[PDB]
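Repro case for the chain-ordering regression, as requested:
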Amino acid sequence: TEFWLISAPGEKTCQQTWEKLHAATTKNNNLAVSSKFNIPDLKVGTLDVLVGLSDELAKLDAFVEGVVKKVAQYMADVLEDSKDKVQENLLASGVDLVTYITRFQWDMAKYPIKQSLKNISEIIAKGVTQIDNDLKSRASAYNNLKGNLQNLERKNAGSLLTRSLAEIVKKDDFVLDSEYLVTLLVVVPKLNHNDWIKQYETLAEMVVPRSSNVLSEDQDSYLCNVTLFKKAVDDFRHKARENKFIVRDFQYNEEEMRADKEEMNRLSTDKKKQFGPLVRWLKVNFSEAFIAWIHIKALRVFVESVLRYGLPVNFQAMLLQPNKKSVKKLREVLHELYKHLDEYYPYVYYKIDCNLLE
Amino acid sequence: SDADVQKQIKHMMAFIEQEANEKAEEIDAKAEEEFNIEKGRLVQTQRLKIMEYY
Amino acid sequence: RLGFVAGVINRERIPTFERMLWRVCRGNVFLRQAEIENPLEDPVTGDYVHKSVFIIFFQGDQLKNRVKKICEGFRASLYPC
Amino acid sequence: LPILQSHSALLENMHIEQLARRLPARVQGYPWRLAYSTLEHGTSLKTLYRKSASLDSPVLLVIKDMDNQIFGAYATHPFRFSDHYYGTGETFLYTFSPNFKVFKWSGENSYFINGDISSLELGGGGGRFGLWLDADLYHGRSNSCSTFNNDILSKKEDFIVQDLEVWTFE
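-- result from build under test --
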């Protein structure tokens, strides 16, 4: 969904050109759903300001579009499930994008019409620059917690080669806290385990018989403790690797199993405690960034109209919702209505894109 | 076409008329601001000095 | 402050020159031009060129920079008056 | 619902809520951080400026006079020295009298905030100030100014500050 904005002079007052315009764009065929657009009478001034703004507002448009797109994408990045509900949460003035475009309001309190075009443009630049500063801050908060929970999940997923020791390690399977004794830990495929049950006793000297003790088994593999005298261990581990038996030593590490459990609980809980505030801040920031984005469109339209028609203003700001089947005929009617005024056009032209919600 | 050149000449008159007023209004606005600041700072300082004397 | 420039350009460049002036100084440039009473001789090649005078009017230095950039783009020469 | 402060303050939880109801959207729902306080820091104008000069955020001023009345202002920018006026229309003055009262911008002039070498001041309208404080934050003045059309705020037009604080949003 896309909307077009235009502006052009009235014959003596703004109404008179609109009456012909909106009729032709809706009555020749449904070329666009057509209306006035809500740009107020901002305080005019010197060409030095208007031309400076005519370049600065274009740089600010590209920046503010990038910021409001990033706000929308951050809301999509917290909505990792219910992705389609993005369009129910991206709102401006409390309504859907197409609605606040169609029903635009200039904020005469946040952007007082009696201020200069430079002052209003700087309020947008500063405000949205702080939204970008907030997006850098909130990314550093969220993306690290996201990545840590993904790594905790990767430590739970897959076979005994990747799932967590904290789910399977128990004290009775270990021989530790000793001068001459060690417990080693090894992973083996479920087929190869039938050899491993005997073969571990052949890897090194100083191994007691019947000392392989499985912690658990799965769809691919087994993990076992091996209990043995200390002299065996370095030859045992090296010859295990040379025979593709994968060493994964974890000697009942109470601090590490406690860390995996507490951090799995914490990072899930903290990701939820980020998600709520993030959706609220991203709603306010999206509202303000999209409002301010359309205020750059309104400023570009206004500044170019006060340029193209000077200070004795009678122009109408206008809104169109083009139909893709007839958009070439829409341009032809807009030209037919306005060819006497002078991509480029004899009328003022700009657009708004609703695909922030994809 | 000369008619559009005459429109542009009339537009240039509107810019410089209101730009001359805009420069004057900035000078006047600064004059009122400096009047307020100078009168306020001086009066309150001297008023406090005579109040300490009282 | 008011501002203006005056200069000389080859006569065939005028339609693109005035269009570009109205693009950079968006919709707003007062100007005039006329052909010189004879073509003028090139100091290096000795070719005779059908040059034309022009004059351009505006406000402030921001428009002075736009009109001057387009004059240089069409290889036109401005003079003080 | 009502805001949490980083420390104790001149204000009760009912005062905090009554002020929090008036916050603009840039600062709504933020906890309040102590910028300056006569209860925690040196009683002087230069200290208030120095403690505020590292900020780049809105602030809440709070005052208790020697007649126990509480008053102050929300302001869009930190307190500092200023050659000209600064601040924007979200700035307002307030008091508890004993009920809470607020005095938002009149629209008449941009004379929101200024700082002299030897004073801090709010508002304009000739020789009048909506708030004024000396170099010690000891003597102060408060009367109706055209920037806010405010009441006296203190118990008397001339007042002595018992205590003063500045807070910000973080």
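Ordering looks correct now. Residues 60-73 of chain C form the longest helix (14 residues).
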